[PDB]
């Protein structure tokens, strides 16, 4: 369960980039409210002549244009402002020749089906001003046809060429967010963009060689109209410190109900379901949550073990001297056996065990093992509280999740059975040796340990010795059960905690209290 | 230099179905089962078509 | 192990597109260089 969710992430990080790379290109260089809407707008043009005799034009282009107006909606007069701009315009030209007396248009813009028209809109009602958290918005608008008027090119001598025709229809396409910054204040808006379809009539330039072209030129796109209008309706659907609360919020999680929710592959789609946000948060956020992971504890560490294998299997000819408590070199055992890069205070064994725990432990998880794996107790903690909070906003979800990994279940140990011998690497401190059956302790070994750890399945000892031996005596514990209570079987464990209620309910609970972060 | 994009109507929901059914009445047996022991994941499904 | 890595890839190829599709809207400009282009006939000056 947690197994996935966690790992599932580091698996899908490669994505982080692609997405990341988008917002750049694109980056720079509750309560519902309704309202029919009337969008009136117009284009503007810039026409620049070349110098010389006066037969040549250098540029005919679109320019943003503002419009202001008032209309009635629900018995109230609404004042609205719009700004119309275009994107993806096409550069055309006309070359009548290189003589000073030959008609030329060096560059004129035309909007076609690969172009967009944007109309920014603001009005003075109250629902509009109260839009700062937006969970969702759709518009149902009529289309409008924009047709080109004539534009005469007044040559110094003779008959004047005239650009005429051209037309496109505008269709509501995609709804976003947006905001206008003028000399002092801001005008929130979710400017829609219109996709275009070319329409009749085509355009041409009389007296020349330009006819039967489709699209709308920038020469006279308003065709003498005071404005173009698109009307319809739109519907809107609307809605350090952190830690100290997570902790307290944990002190209540049930027991049985928890465990279970650690036998359910709470993967990707699951975790970011409950969250309810304004926009593409949880989305690029499930991606940001990523763009946090690949930059933290769990990350690098795992990235290390990985190499420590390659490097030590690739080297060999020059295998690191290191050292190995066990048959032979093998990252897991040895690399920890030697790079006891920290120091002072107690006894031998414990130190390696420990350092061999670090890798072995936490680390192991994100790969292969049985029964409820620590983390799957952690995930449970998360998918829990991260729901009993309700929040939305981006800057939160990331990190906090990550950080959960690095700081959950500070310590914890593991075990490896083999011939009825529970070998328990009590991380940090301790280590014991069983006789599986009659819960007993005989000299533990750094050796027998070495290997049997390296390449065999491990177990995230839910309950360890302490709890176990104390459990075995004041109860019974059939050989049957026991054998399961080791593999950290879901069932058999769930039973007790659910049924009996003695000890077991502390070894468990205590862990919850430990994933306090 | 075409004025307006082509517009091609598509087959209706109810439609398509009536054919899927009939097209099923022929699927073999053994051949089928097997193809349910092969992780037909993403890349697989949208290969043909 | 390799099992994943290998397969893992062909599994996540569908992505190739999405990404691929980005760098375009993003790269340079595209240009329609097919303006049809018509061929020959020969006709000429006729006066004395």
């Amino acid at each position: 369960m947690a197994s996935l969710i966690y790992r599932q992430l580091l698996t899908n990080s490669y994505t982080v980039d692609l997405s990341d790379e988008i917002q750049e290109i694109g980056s720079t260089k509750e309560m519902q409210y309704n309202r029919d809407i009337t969008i009136r707008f117009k284009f503007a043009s810039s026409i620049v002549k070349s110098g010389g005799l006066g037969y040549k034009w250098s540029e005919i282009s679109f320019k943003p244009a503002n419009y202001q107006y008032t209309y009635t909606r629900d018995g109230e007069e609404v004042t609205a402002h719009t700004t119309c701009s275009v994107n993806g315009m096409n550069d055309f030209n006309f070359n009548g020749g290189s003589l000073p007396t030959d008609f030329v248009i060096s560059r004129y813009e035309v909007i076609k089906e690969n172009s967009y028209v944007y109309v920014d809109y603001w009005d003075d009602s109250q629902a509009f001003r109260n839009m700062v958290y937006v969970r969702s918005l759709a518009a149902n608008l009529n289309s409008v046809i924009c047709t080109g008027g004539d534009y005469s090119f007044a040559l110094p001598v003779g008959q004047w060429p005239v650009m005429t025709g051209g037309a496109v229809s505008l269709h509501s396409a995609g709804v976003t967010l947006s905001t206008q910054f003028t000399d002092f204040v801001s005008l929130n808006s979710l400017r829609f963009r219109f996709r275009l379809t070319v329409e009749e009539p085509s355009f041409s330039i009389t007296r020349t060689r330009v006819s039967r072209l489709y699209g709308l030129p920038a020469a006279n796109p308003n065709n003498g109209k005071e404005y173009y209008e698109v009307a319809g309706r739109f519907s809107l659907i609307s809605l350090g410190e952190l830690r100290e609360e997570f902790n307290a919020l944990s002190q209540e999680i049930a027991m049985s109900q928890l465990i279970d929710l650690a036998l359910l592959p709470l993967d990707m789609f699951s975790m970011f379901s409950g969250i309810k946000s304004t926009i593409d948060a949880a989305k690029s956020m499930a991606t940001s949550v990523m763009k946090k992971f690949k930059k933290s504890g769990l990350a690098n560490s795992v990235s290390t073990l990985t190499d420590s294998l390659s490097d030590a299997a690739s080297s060999i000819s020059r295998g690191a001297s290191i050292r190995s408590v066990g048959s032979s070199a093998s990252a897991w055992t040895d690399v920890s056996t030697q790079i006891t890069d920290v120091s002072s205070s107690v006894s031998s064994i414990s130190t390696q065990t420990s350092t061999i725990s670090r890798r072995l432990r936490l680390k192991e998880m994100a790969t292969q093992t049985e029964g409820m794996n620590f983390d799957d107790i952690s995930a449970a903690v998360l998918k829990t509280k991260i729901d009993r909070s309700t929040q939305i906003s981006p800057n939160t979800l990331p990190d906090i999740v990550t950080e959960a990994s690095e700081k959950f279940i500070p310590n914890r140990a593991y075990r490896v059975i083999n011939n009825d011998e529970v070998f328990e690497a009590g991380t940090d401190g301790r280590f014991f040796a069983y006789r599986v059956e009659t819960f007993d302790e005989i000299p533990f070994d750094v050796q027998k340990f070495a290997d049997l750890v390296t390449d065999s399945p491990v177990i995230s000892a839910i309950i360890d010795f302490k709890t176990l031996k104390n459990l075995n005596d004041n109860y019974g514990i059939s050989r049957q059960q026991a054998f399961n209570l080791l593999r950290s079987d879901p069932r058999v464990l769930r039973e007790f905690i659910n049924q009996d209620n003695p000890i077991i309910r502390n070894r468990i609970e205590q862990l919850i209290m430990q994933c306090r972060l | 230099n075409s004025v307006t994009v082509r517009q091609d109507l598509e087959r209706q929901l109810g439609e398509l179905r009536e054919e899927f059914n009939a097209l099923s009445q022929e699927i073999a047996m053994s051949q089928l089962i097997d193809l349910a022991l092969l992780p037909l994941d993403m890349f697989s499904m949208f290969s043909g078509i | 192990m390799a099992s994943l890595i290998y397969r893992q890839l062909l599994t996540n190829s569908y992505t190739v597109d999405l990404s691929d599709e980005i760098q375009e809207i993003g790269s340079t400009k595209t240009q329609n260089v097919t303006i049809n282009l018509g061929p020959f006939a020969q006709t000429g000056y006729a006066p004395v």
Binding site: D36, N140, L141, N142, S143, V144, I145, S169, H171, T197, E199, G232, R233 | T4, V5, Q7, D8, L9, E10, Q12, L13, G14, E15 | -
Partner: protein
Amino acid sequence: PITGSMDTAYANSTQEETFLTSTLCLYYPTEAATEINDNSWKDTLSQLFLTKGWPTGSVYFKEYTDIASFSVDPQLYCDYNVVLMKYDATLQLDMSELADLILNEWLCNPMDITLYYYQQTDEANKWISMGSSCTIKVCPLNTQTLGIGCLTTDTATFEEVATAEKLVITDVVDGVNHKLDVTTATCTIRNCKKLGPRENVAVIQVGGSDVLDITADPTTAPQTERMMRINWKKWWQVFYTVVDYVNQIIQAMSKRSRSLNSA
């Protein structure tokens, strides 16, 4: 579900509960009454109705003056409604559209022609519009919200499917969106799903060689009991017959179960 055990225990009668508890509403055209020319015809017929077993305050007489107005206003007043229709050959269909409405059980929702272009779903989703002057022009949309034989921008390219009718049940190719252009000033167009029939009306047809289609398709032709026909002589005769056979006509209908939220 009901238990299916059969052991015969006939109720005996049926008509003696309907005589006591139900209302009968007779709809006729003006011409019908004008030809009768009496200030007491409604009264005389009422006493005659006691014979067939309907208590004085039981029967009501509603006057539609045309099939077009009646078609708009079928706010059927009584338990049992038997409507008398006069064979006007130019109005046939108008008549067909009106029959289709009374004889059947309808479910409708309102349509906003202004903001949302619609589509019918099955052989039972139809657009029933009615009013002063109903003029409906349509424009089929391809999967892009673009016209097909029309420009969603200029209604001069639309396809006219109704020119000033008083009642219209419009049918378009199922599963296709359409920008609609009705003359909402004088018309109202609503999206209806059909179904249940009417266990009341009993359109009685005067004149012709009365066979007429009431399906939108070509494949089916349904003939129901609530669709009767009488041979014209004089209007007084028509009413005498309607009275002389009230129960027979009522028996061909019989009280509704629709749990109709409009009421």
